[PDB]
Nucleic acid binder design. Structure first.
Ligand SMILES: [Ca+2]
Ligand SMILES: [Ca+2]
Ligand SMILES: [Ca+2]
Length: 341
DNA sequence: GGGGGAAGGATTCC
DNA sequence: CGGAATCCTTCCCCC
């Protein structure tokens, strides 16, 4: 198996650089403004000229504006990035049919039946990089290895605008001397949680006992890291479909008033059904972010599709169930639909 | 004992 | 002091 991984570099910010070439060379920060005070929100994407000064995705906008006060701060236009991303994805499927779109800015290509060795794959990645650059002016990073995890690791090491092949020998080497926190799927919570057991490298998960690792980081991520340490990970490249569509809005003013929250919730439903397009959902969940930024959610699955009018009635019932079983105020309210037909 | 699925909190990531 | 989506553990019914 030879998997090729393509990751669009700082995608959100690069599309803004492409749509306005006056921005390249300058620090660019793509933000999400909730709309409470003037600069309330978070950073979604920052280019590398902004990441060098500590501006990274996740931090508040005012924390970014304290570091780079005159950097270019633009609002996030997800609909634009999704259309550009879909165009690039269509270029990728001309190189292989077995494609796994993992996110808006990355996809896995199974080029086992198109390429003999890692040299042919490296030359294929160079042509994929040039094509994306020629047709969309977007630079990507290419990772090639024996499975999806190490193909993504290759791109993680050579980003941005890079290419890297991890052969069978470097895999066994990376198993011993790669930080466990830089394994795909290992976020911050599991990483710090893994440091509390001395687990710093991938090889160390074998020298521990399974039930100890299972009770701490969960059985799922336990078997995941074990299979990688045994060099037995070989998950296939499968077509990924979108399973959930929802929209959450930050309400102006916190509230526990049903009539005050309903307009936001009904607005969230309308925008959710518009993005649903022809998809008919059978499950609906009402989710609320409390004043202390905690999340509470109530759901309900139907034996049939949910019409928009049914979603209106059921969402009020679920939101009432939230207010009945939690006494905190609500800061953000929203809905999510799943279990399509 | 566990299949099968629903509920919803917990993580990951742009 | 965002927001989208998936992950994944528990719980439940019942054969
Ligand atoms: Ca990216
Ligand atoms: Ca990515
Ligand atoms: Ca990580």
């Amino acid at each position: 198996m030879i998997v090729l991984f393509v990751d669009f570099d700082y995608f959100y910010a690069q599309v803004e650089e492409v749509l306005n070439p006056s921005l390249k060379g300058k620090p660019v920060v793509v933000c999400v403004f909730s709309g409470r005070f003037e600069d309330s929100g978070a950073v979604a994407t920052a280019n590398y000229e902004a990441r060098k000064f500590g501006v990274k995705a996740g931090i508040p906008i005012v924390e970014a504006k304290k570091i780079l006060p005159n950097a270019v701060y633009l609002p996030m236009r997800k609909e634009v990035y999704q259309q550009v991303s879909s165009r690039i994805m269509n270029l990728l499927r001309e190189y292989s049919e077995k494609i796994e779109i993992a996110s808006i800015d990355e996809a896995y290509l199974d080029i086992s039946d198109k390429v003999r060795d890692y040299r042919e794959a490296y030359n294929l990645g160079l042509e994929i990089k040039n094509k994306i650059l020629e047709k969309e002016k977007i630079t990507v990073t290419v990772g090639i290895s024996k499975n999806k995890v190490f193909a993504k690791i290759a791109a993680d090491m050579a980003k941005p605008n890079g290419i890297k092949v991890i052969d069978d020998e470097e895999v066994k080497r990376l198993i011993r001397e790669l930080d466990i926190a830089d394994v795909p799927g290992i976020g911050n919570i599991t990483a710090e949680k893994l440091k509390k057991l001395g687990i710093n490298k991938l090889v160390d998960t074998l020298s521990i006992e399974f039930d100890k690792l299972k009770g701490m980081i969960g059985e799922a991520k336990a078997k995941y890291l074990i299979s990688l340490a045994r060099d037995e990970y070989n998950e296939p490249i499968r077509t990924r479909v979108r399973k959930s569509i929802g929209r959450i809005v930050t309400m102006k003013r916190n509230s526990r008033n049903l009539e005050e929250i309903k307009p936001y919730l009904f607005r969230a439903i309308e925008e959710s059904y518009y993005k649903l397009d022809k998809r008919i959902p059978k499950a609906i969940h009402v989710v609320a972010v409390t004043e202390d930024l905690d999340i509470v959610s109530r759901g309900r699955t139907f034996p049939h599709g949910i019409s928009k009018e049914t979603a209106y009635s059921e969402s009020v019932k679920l939101l009432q169930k939230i207010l009945e079983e939690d006494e905190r105020k609500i800061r953000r309210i929203g809905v999510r639909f799943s279990k399509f037909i």
